[PDB]
Amino acid sequence: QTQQLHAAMADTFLEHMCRLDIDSPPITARNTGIICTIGPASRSVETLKEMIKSGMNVARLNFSHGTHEYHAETIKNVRTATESFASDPILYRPVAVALDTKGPEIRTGLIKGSGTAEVELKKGATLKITLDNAYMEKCDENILWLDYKNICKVVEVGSKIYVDDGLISLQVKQKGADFLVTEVENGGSLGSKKGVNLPGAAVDLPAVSEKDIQDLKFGVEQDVDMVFASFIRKASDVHEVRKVLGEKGKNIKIISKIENHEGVRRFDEILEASDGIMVARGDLGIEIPAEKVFLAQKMMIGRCNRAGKPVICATQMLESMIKKPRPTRAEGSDVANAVLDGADCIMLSGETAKGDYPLEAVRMQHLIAREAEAAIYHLQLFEELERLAPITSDPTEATAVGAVEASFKCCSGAIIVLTKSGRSAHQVARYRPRAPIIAVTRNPQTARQAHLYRGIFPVLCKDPVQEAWAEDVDLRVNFAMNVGKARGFFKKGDVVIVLTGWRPGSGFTNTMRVVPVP
Amino acid sequence: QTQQLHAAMADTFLEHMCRLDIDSPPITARNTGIICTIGPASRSVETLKEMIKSGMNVARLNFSHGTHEYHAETIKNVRTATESFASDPILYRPVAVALDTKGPEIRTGLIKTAEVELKKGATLKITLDNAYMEKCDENILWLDYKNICKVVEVGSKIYVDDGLISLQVKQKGADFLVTEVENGGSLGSKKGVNLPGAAVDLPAVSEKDIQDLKFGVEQDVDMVFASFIRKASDVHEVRKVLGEKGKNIKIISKIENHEGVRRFDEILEASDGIMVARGDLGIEIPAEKVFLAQKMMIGRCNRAGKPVICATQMLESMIKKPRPTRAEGSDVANAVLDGADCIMLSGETAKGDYPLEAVRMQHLIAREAEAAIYHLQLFEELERLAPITSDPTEATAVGAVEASFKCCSGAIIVLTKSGRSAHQVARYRPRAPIIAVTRNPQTARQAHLYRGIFPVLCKDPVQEAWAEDVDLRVNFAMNVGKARGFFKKGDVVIVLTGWRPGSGFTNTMRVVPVP
Amino acid sequence: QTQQLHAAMADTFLEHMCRLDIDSPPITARNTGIICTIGPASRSVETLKEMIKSGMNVARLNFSHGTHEYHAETIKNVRTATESFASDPILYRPVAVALDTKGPEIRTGLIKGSGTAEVELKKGATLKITLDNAYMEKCDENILWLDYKNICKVVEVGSKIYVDDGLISLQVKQKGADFLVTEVENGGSLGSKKGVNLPGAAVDLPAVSEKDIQDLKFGVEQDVDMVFASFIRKASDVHEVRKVLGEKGKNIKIISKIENHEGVRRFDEILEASDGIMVARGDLGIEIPAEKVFLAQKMMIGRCNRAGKPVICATQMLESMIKKPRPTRAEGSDVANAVLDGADCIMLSGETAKGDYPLEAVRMQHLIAREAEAAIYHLQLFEELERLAPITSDPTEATAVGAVEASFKCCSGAIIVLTKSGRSAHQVARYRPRAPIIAVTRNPQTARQAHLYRGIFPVLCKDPVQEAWAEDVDLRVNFAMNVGKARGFFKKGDVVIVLTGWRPGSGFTNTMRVVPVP
Ligand SMILES: O=P(O)(O)OC[C@H]1O[C@](O)(COP(=O)(O)O)[C@@H](O)[C@@H]1O
Ligand SMILES: O=P(O)(O)OC[C@H]1O[C@](O)(COP(=O)(O)O)[C@@H](O)[C@@H]1O
Ligand SMILES: O=P(O)(O)OC[C@H]1O[C@](O)(COP(=O)(O)O)[C@@H](O)[C@@H]1O
Ligand SMILES: [K+]
Ligand SMILES: [K+]
Ligand SMILES: [K+]
Ligand SMILES: [Mg+2]
Ligand SMILES: [Mg+2]
Ligand SMILES: [Mg+2]
């Protein structure tokens, strides 16, 4: 009568839905990664500590805004808050840092005069668009400037142009070279520097601009753990980002953001080149008809799970929590269905960057992820992941799937794995056990990147190596036991699964033990 | 393209069938146990060595016939043939000895070693005057069941000689029944008699049975096949007689009548395994219903995780000819597909002209059939029907089998003192052979009852360091597998072990390359 | 608690097996066809009448033996027996006649002396096989003649040779021209004119010999319904057979007998070209290792089920009943499992052609089939057959599959179908309903050939055509009900499914009705 174990026993999906209970409380452990965007509301040290206690795993910096120096000062504070807890290495939480590139964004110019100044637009009214730099800080209700110099080559008559994140639409009546005349189809106020999207068009900007180059190089300087590459359209876009990171950034992980039609059409070659995927729903839902977005979301998450690569669901998950302390019912549903669909991580944007309730937002996500994890139908999920996954002779693969079937058989409080690269923990997570995966590593980077995988609770063993390998192994296992008790995941005399290798070095995980908690 | 691995991939049973292929060769290992009835044809030491090499696992002695001195000698020969292979521990094969009780049979009398001949429509009086107990003929017939006249009615049907001859009852009384013959045939001496519609109140454990089970205990048999078990208390009666001294002897109940079928669930619970006794069962219930009973029992046994044995007329034509009929081919293969742990030969090995050919042919067929099982479905069914547990050992067993499928392992190697750890694995029915390494030679002989368990008996003395004693026995298993052709250097096997000595602590699963 | 209805309710195959109950009695209807081979024991009119009441649906004539005059008299008798029941059109049962060809057999010659003579062959003995026609009637223990002139070309030292249904095995020790020297391996006594098999060998005998041609012409003259073509090795073999049947016998059904390695290897092209398949296990279990036959059986059955074509299981199903009035447990089990495998028809050979208990064997097949039909796991079968079925716009297909599902939901007593060609009845049977399919037709050939499909109970309407079509339809629907009532398939108030088209002529079946029985 807990963890939805009654519904876990159903022999159909529908009987499984029918058995779900609001009075079956979940376990302590939460498997889904939380990712928070840091900005004015959340960049203070004091508050960042509170985000970490609340459940933040990764901190994301949007490089569509702000300066290398401002960002460097966010990071510094994230690292200070994080290390504030190394005091007790048993309760320490590694906290990753991710870099979100500008990429091929299209923006409007400044509104003439005051900073905040917006101009009201009205349906049917007229708007001329120019590329004349005279006008770039002189935008208003008749004339508007755009930073995409080649716009006219690619937008025809009939075309639609959305501005301010889908909320203002315009139609292309007449067009020269230099300028476009438009009729306003949906009005509203327009401020300075707003996102422009061109649904019909083949936008021809480079995947990595010189601005992107400098930003990527800065992130290599700063030892960030991952990069969220914007607007990826094809594999070669991914490789180009991989080259700009080069040898020095070779361990930093690349998440292609999919946020347009081409990204979606060529998803297979992009996923093959990337380390993970983000479903970038804001842009994506302007670049395609908003009603189609749920399908791309489910296509991308499914294929990532089929391929054992992390997928993040993003944007407007709890929008209303920017202004209010509780979410709407669609927001509640949406976070929960992201987890149920299969998402490894879930992202907060404005809600933590600039909102009036960043901590509450983090908590709500933590609370909902945990309910929805219990609600997942593991029976079917696990069987469908066994079937699709190929056959191999890799003993770690066999050991990984054995540990998972065993975790179901005995309702183990956790599956513990020792791992240098993380790779042995990733092989377990791909099969989606209910129980949490406590990944014990010495490598601080592996610990931080581990958060991209559903279920991995990384822990960082700071202790020196023993002279006897067998003793060193057992000390790490036992470290995972102490973390699990201290966290409430399990208590003494509960059974856990433990994974280890037949010899030192990566790639040898082959041993699975069913072990009582000491 | 080997082991029907193509068929094993399919999404449906029907596509699985379509992908079955006569040119996909089976692995060398054979998982289904073979039991052979020993008799005039096969009781010599010379013939028994060859039966073992051809794949016999359990020697059955039928106590419906023979004297204790006779069976004691049979055993002595089996133990001799078996021990002749201890020369090389790596190739030694444990052989079990099983005792199969007479039970409450009914038999005819002697004849006036000659045979009279009943014709359809003819008249036959049946009698209980013991003066006639050694002169039966076309007219008069003696049976040794004294209450026969109390339980029969006007019209009831009597089958004689394993169902070949049949009589109907035209008039009753006491001492006499008058019967019309319905199926003619050549009656002989002391033949089986069956009274389908009737409830026979003979003891389950008769005076003779009691002395025969004692023989079992003294002779040190491994298991007992108790005939005509009708209800759970019959099995308790048997367990009692075996008593304290006989308590590690497994009791396999033989279902051969309508009541045993009906009270199957309770008999299963009390028994350590089941034998589907198709000979008698197929006269006591209509022959067309046997396959239903058989599949019901194999099914409930696989569900309970207890061994079940298919028996009787599996290769009947091979008593006289050296190839079986096509039916006989089919039937053996379907018993394995149904889920039988063991298959059995009777007359084929006891008294036929081709005992070794019959054993070989069970070995070949079982090996083909085990590769044609749709494990995808079978494993998911057994895994699901399994109640969740706290036992680390169940978890470890299921983890092992899951891993044996993901990497198509050459075997699952298990150390076990009592057998129990190997049994847990075999309940889930891996494709891969389970090589169970033990020092207890009784554990090794009984382990044949379970599908896929190839017991190996370790004769090495105990190393003083426990980890080294564990490795040695793992390596021994490896050498057995290499030598028998189950696998070779660099293949993967699963290895299952515990974290300390003593029963009940198996908790460790390793995926290991063969050295 | 009848028809194994408790077992039909189970969620898994394994639970389905567990609930099979020997006290859950079957319905009256038997769905699997029974094909009896005719010969001395069964060819009297008196005996044939009773074969028919006992359940023979098809009369099989084995052309490997006997003259045209003798077979003509057999057919005459088949039809006298059959037509003896036409007095009562309600109880009248179409009985088909099938011709089984000789084909490329290899046969020995005559034993010297007595026509009835045998010789002993003893393990270790030398036996010489000659082609010199001198010896064709002087065969004995030292010298054996056979009728395949090219045998020496196709065998080598080491080869095996089986004689008389695999009883006797020889091993070639030397290969001359015009002879072989062999060692007897399995001895046994040998009589005259016995079949020879060469497992190793690329036998080259012609698909359709001069004698097969005489024979097929004769079948066309006698208006047989189906041909069983022996030793089909490839599609062109089937074509060759079709030519000889030509126009006069274009609608005569060709069932390819698979009895050798090449047939099995090329099964798909043979299947496509044929109207049906027989698994001829006698020859097959000598041409391939005996332990592999059950594989071939199940491959062929599954593939014919998948394609919707009749498949017959044949040979030694009840062999002991040639001498004993009750079958062995393996035989009882073999038959059940052929039905459970998915076979449309099961066949009897010596059991009915020369044995002592022809009626009893026919009755046993009836009884076992009826039990085994109930024990089928229809939930899974029907789900998979629907699943595998290619998708079609064909209204008749959609109607068939709706009728089958409807028959399941209301546990109907029959599926009544009107059909000219048989086709619409076949499309129901391919989906494998529990309920018997009663096919009403005015076409006597259609009736006789429907016996090759599991479930079809053909009924032959002799009444003339009503002027008003709608009444002509009702009249045949109503003749089906009378047949069902009289046979005890159902009774007044039971529901049945009735299938019709929207106009006369073949191909228009599109109407399913759920109908209480008056
Ligand atoms: O996940 P990875 O990178 O393969 O790391 C797993 C490795 O960790 C170990 O358990 C311990 O190795 P170290 O002692 O070198 O950390 C190995 O046995 C195993 O092969
Ligand atoms: O299957 P069983 O009878 O419980 O025996 C399994 C036992 O065998 C072992 O692997 C070896 O024990 P021993 O050293 O006592 O033979 C134990 O670790 C384990 O508990
Ligand atoms: O199976 P077939 O040969 O298509 O026969 C089915 C045909 O039988 C009918 O039900 C009626 O046939 P009739 O021409 O005999 O009236 C048609 O509606 C239907 O098209
Ligand atoms: K960005
Ligand atoms: K007995
Ligand atoms: K023939
Ligand atoms: Mg974007
Ligand atoms: Mg018996
Ligand atoms: Mg043939």
PDB file of N, CA and C in Angstrom, chain C residues 336-377:
ATOM      1  N   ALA C 336      -3.890 -34.785 -30.434  1.00  0.00           N
ATOM      2  CA  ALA C 336      -4.181 -33.555 -29.701  1.00  0.00           C
ATOM      3  C   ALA C 336      -3.256 -32.446 -30.080  1.00  0.00           C
ATOM      4  N   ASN C 337      -1.978 -32.743 -30.190  1.00  0.00           N
ATOM      5  CA  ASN C 337      -1.038 -31.685 -30.420  1.00  0.00           C
ATOM      6  C   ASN C 337      -1.006 -31.181 -31.822  1.00  0.00           C
ATOM      7  N   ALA C 338      -1.407 -32.010 -32.770  1.00  0.00           N
ATOM      8  CA  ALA C 338      -1.529 -31.552 -34.140  1.00  0.00           C
ATOM      9  C   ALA C 338      -2.685 -30.540 -34.204  1.00  0.00           C
ATOM     10  N   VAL C 339      -3.801 -30.894 -33.592  1.00  0.00           N
ATOM     11  CA  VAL C 339      -4.911 -29.963 -33.526  1.00  0.00           C
ATOM     12  C   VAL C 339      -4.482 -28.680 -32.803  1.00  0.00           C
ATOM     13  N   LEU C 340      -3.866 -28.836 -31.626  1.00  0.00           N
ATOM     14  CA  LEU C 340      -3.388 -27.690 -30.876  1.00  0.00           C
ATOM     15  C   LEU C 340      -2.345 -26.933 -31.674  1.00  0.00           C
ATOM     16  N   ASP C 341      -1.479 -27.622 -32.429  1.00  0.00           N
ATOM     17  CA  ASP C 341      -0.480 -26.896 -33.261  1.00  0.00           C
ATOM     18  C   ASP C 341      -1.172 -25.892 -34.236  1.00  0.00           C
ATOM     19  N   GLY C 342      -2.372 -26.211 -34.727  1.00  0.00           N
ATOM     20  CA  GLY C 342      -3.052 -25.423 -35.729  1.00  0.00           C
ATOM     21  C   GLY C 342      -3.425 -26.193 -37.020  1.00  0.00           C
ATOM     22  N   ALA C 343      -3.284 -27.524 -37.054  1.00  0.00           N
ATOM     23  CA  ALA C 343      -3.675 -28.312 -38.217  1.00  0.00           C
ATOM     24  C   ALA C 343      -5.178 -28.262 -38.550  1.00  0.00           C
ATOM     25  N   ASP C 344      -5.482 -28.178 -39.838  1.00  0.00           N
ATOM     26  CA  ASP C 344      -6.840 -28.154 -40.314  1.00  0.00           C
ATOM     27  C   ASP C 344      -7.399 -29.542 -40.381  1.00  0.00           C
ATOM     28  N   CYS C 345      -6.586 -30.468 -40.841  1.00  0.00           N
ATOM     29  CA  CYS C 345      -7.034 -31.836 -40.988  1.00  0.00           C
ATOM     30  C   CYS C 345      -5.979 -32.747 -40.449  1.00  0.00           C
ATOM     31  N   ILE C 346      -6.442 -33.917 -40.025  1.00  0.00           N
ATOM     32  CA  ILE C 346      -5.583 -34.985 -39.612  1.00  0.00           C
ATOM     33  C   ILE C 346      -5.967 -36.211 -40.438  1.00  0.00           C
ATOM     34  N   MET C 347      -4.988 -37.057 -40.688  1.00  0.00           N
ATOM     35  CA  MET C 347      -5.131 -38.155 -41.625  1.00  0.00           C
ATOM     36  C   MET C 347      -4.904 -39.495 -40.999  1.00  0.00           C
ATOM     37  N   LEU C 348      -5.563 -40.495 -41.535  1.00  0.00           N
ATOM     38  CA  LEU C 348      -5.362 -41.866 -41.110  1.00  0.00           C
ATOM     39  C   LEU C 348      -4.909 -42.580 -42.347  1.00  0.00           C
ATOM     40  N   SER C 349      -3.914 -43.486 -42.216  1.00  0.00           N
ATOM     41  CA  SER C 349      -3.413 -44.302 -43.358  1.00  0.00           C
ATOM     42  C   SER C 349      -3.703 -45.801 -43.185  1.00  0.00           C
ATOM     43  N   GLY C 350      -2.743 -46.591 -42.754  1.00  0.00           N
ATOM     44  CA  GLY C 350      -2.981 -48.003 -42.584  1.00  0.00           C
ATOM     45  C   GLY C 350      -4.065 -48.241 -41.602  1.00  0.00           C
ATOM     46  N   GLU C 351      -4.216 -47.328 -40.649  1.00  0.00           N
ATOM     47  CA  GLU C 351      -5.179 -47.507 -39.546  1.00  0.00           C
ATOM     48  C   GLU C 351      -6.543 -47.814 -40.064  1.00  0.00           C
ATOM     49  N   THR C 352      -6.897 -47.194 -41.209  1.00  0.00           N
ATOM     50  CA  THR C 352      -8.207 -47.419 -41.889  1.00  0.00           C
ATOM     51  C   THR C 352      -8.170 -48.249 -43.226  1.00  0.00           C
ATOM     52  N   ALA C 353      -7.027 -48.222 -43.925  1.00  0.00           N
ATOM     53  CA  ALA C 353      -6.866 -48.943 -45.219  1.00  0.00           C
ATOM     54  C   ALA C 353      -6.691 -50.481 -45.104  1.00  0.00           C
ATOM     55  N   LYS C 354      -6.012 -50.954 -44.049  1.00  0.00           N
ATOM     56  CA  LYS C 354      -5.744 -52.393 -43.879  1.00  0.00           C
ATOM     57  C   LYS C 354      -5.842 -52.947 -42.433  1.00  0.00           C
ATOM     58  N   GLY C 355      -6.148 -52.097 -41.469  1.00  0.00           N
ATOM     59  CA  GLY C 355      -6.127 -52.531 -40.075  1.00  0.00           C
ATOM     60  C   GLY C 355      -7.380 -53.228 -39.627  1.00  0.00           C
ATOM     61  N   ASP C 356      -7.439 -53.566 -38.350  1.00  0.00           N
ATOM     62  CA  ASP C 356      -8.521 -54.382 -37.832  1.00  0.00           C
ATOM     63  C   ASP C 356      -9.606 -53.588 -37.151  1.00  0.00           C
ATOM     64  N   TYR C 357      -9.419 -52.269 -37.095  1.00  0.00           N
ATOM     65  CA  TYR C 357     -10.243 -51.393 -36.254  1.00  0.00           C
ATOM     66  C   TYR C 357     -10.446 -50.014 -36.921  1.00  0.00           C
ATOM     67  N   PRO C 358     -10.814 -50.042 -38.193  1.00  0.00           N
ATOM     68  CA  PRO C 358     -10.961 -48.836 -38.944  1.00  0.00           C
ATOM     69  C   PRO C 358     -11.965 -47.885 -38.348  1.00  0.00           C
ATOM     70  N   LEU C 359     -13.081 -48.401 -37.865  1.00  0.00           N
ATOM     71  CA  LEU C 359     -14.103 -47.507 -37.339  1.00  0.00           C
ATOM     72  C   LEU C 359     -13.646 -46.885 -36.046  1.00  0.00           C
ATOM     73  N   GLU C 360     -12.877 -47.637 -35.267  1.00  0.00           N
ATOM     74  CA  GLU C 360     -12.496 -47.175 -33.967  1.00  0.00           C
ATOM     75  C   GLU C 360     -11.480 -46.054 -34.088  1.00  0.00           C
ATOM     76  N   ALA C 361     -10.652 -46.109 -35.121  1.00  0.00           N
ATOM     77  CA  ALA C 361      -9.614 -45.097 -35.324  1.00  0.00           C
ATOM     78  C   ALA C 361     -10.257 -43.795 -35.750  1.00  0.00           C
ATOM     79  N   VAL C 362     -11.220 -43.890 -36.645  1.00  0.00           N
ATOM     80  CA  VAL C 362     -11.943 -42.710 -37.061  1.00  0.00           C
ATOM     81  C   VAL C 362     -12.606 -42.076 -35.844  1.00  0.00           C
ATOM     82  N   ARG C 363     -13.148 -42.907 -34.931  1.00  0.00           N
ATOM     83  CA  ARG C 363     -13.897 -42.394 -33.749  1.00  0.00           C
ATOM     84  C   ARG C 363     -12.979 -41.740 -32.784  1.00  0.00           C
ATOM     85  N   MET C 364     -11.810 -42.334 -32.589  1.00  0.00           N
ATOM     86  CA  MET C 364     -10.807 -41.736 -31.717  1.00  0.00           C
ATOM     87  C   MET C 364     -10.354 -40.367 -32.229  1.00  0.00           C
ATOM     88  N   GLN C 365     -10.192 -40.212 -33.547  1.00  0.00           N
ATOM     89  CA  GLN C 365      -9.696 -38.959 -34.043  1.00  0.00           C
ATOM     90  C   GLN C 365     -10.712 -37.890 -33.774  1.00  0.00           C
ATOM     91  N   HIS C 366     -11.971 -38.270 -33.979  1.00  0.00           N
ATOM     92  CA  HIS C 366     -13.137 -37.459 -33.659  1.00  0.00           C
ATOM     93  C   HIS C 366     -13.133 -36.998 -32.208  1.00  0.00           C
ATOM     94  N   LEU C 367     -13.012 -37.947 -31.283  1.00  0.00           N
ATOM     95  CA  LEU C 367     -13.018 -37.634 -29.894  1.00  0.00           C
ATOM     96  C   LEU C 367     -11.860 -36.743 -29.516  1.00  0.00           C
ATOM     97  N   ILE C 368     -10.649 -37.049 -29.973  1.00  0.00           N
ATOM     98  CA  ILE C 368      -9.474 -36.273 -29.492  1.00  0.00           C
ATOM     99  C   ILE C 368      -9.513 -34.876 -30.040  1.00  0.00           C
ATOM    100  N   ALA C 369      -9.856 -34.768 -31.307  1.00  0.00           N
ATOM    101  CA  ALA C 369      -9.915 -33.457 -31.960  1.00  0.00           C
ATOM    102  C   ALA C 369     -10.875 -32.564 -31.234  1.00  0.00           C
ATOM    103  N   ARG C 370     -11.981 -33.155 -30.806  1.00  0.00           N
ATOM    104  CA  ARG C 370     -13.027 -32.389 -30.188  1.00  0.00           C
ATOM    105  C   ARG C 370     -12.560 -31.865 -28.837  1.00  0.00           C
ATOM    106  N   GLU C 371     -11.805 -32.687 -28.105  1.00  0.00           N
ATOM    107  CA  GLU C 371     -11.220 -32.253 -26.853  1.00  0.00           C
ATOM    108  C   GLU C 371     -10.161 -31.179 -27.011  1.00  0.00           C
ATOM    109  N   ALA C 372      -9.346 -31.337 -28.052  1.00  0.00           N
ATOM    110  CA  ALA C 372      -8.207 -30.506 -28.284  1.00  0.00           C
ATOM    111  C   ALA C 372      -8.654 -29.178 -28.795  1.00  0.00           C
ATOM    112  N   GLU C 373      -9.663 -29.160 -29.627  1.00  0.00           N
ATOM    113  CA  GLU C 373     -10.246 -27.867 -30.039  1.00  0.00           C
ATOM    114  C   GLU C 373     -10.678 -26.961 -28.911  1.00  0.00           C
ATOM    115  N   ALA C 374     -11.189 -27.531 -27.820  1.00  0.00           N
ATOM    116  CA  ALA C 374     -11.605 -26.724 -26.676  1.00  0.00           C
ATOM    117  C   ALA C 374     -10.383 -26.168 -25.964  1.00  0.00           C
ATOM    118  N   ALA C 375      -9.330 -26.946 -25.920  1.00  0.00           N
ATOM    119  CA  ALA C 375      -8.146 -26.603 -25.134  1.00  0.00           C
ATOM    120  C   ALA C 375      -7.252 -25.544 -25.802  1.00  0.00           C
ATOM    121  N   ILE C 376      -7.600 -25.140 -27.007  1.00  0.00           N
ATOM    122  CA  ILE C 376      -6.823 -24.140 -27.715  1.00  0.00           C
ATOM    123  C   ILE C 376      -6.923 -22.843 -26.965  1.00  0.00           C
ATOM    124  N   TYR C 377      -5.850 -22.059 -26.982  1.00  0.00           N
ATOM    125  CA  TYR C 377      -5.844 -20.785 -26.289  1.00  0.00           C
ATOM    126  C   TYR C 377      -6.257 -19.658 -27.247  1.00  0.00           C
TER     127      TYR C 377
END
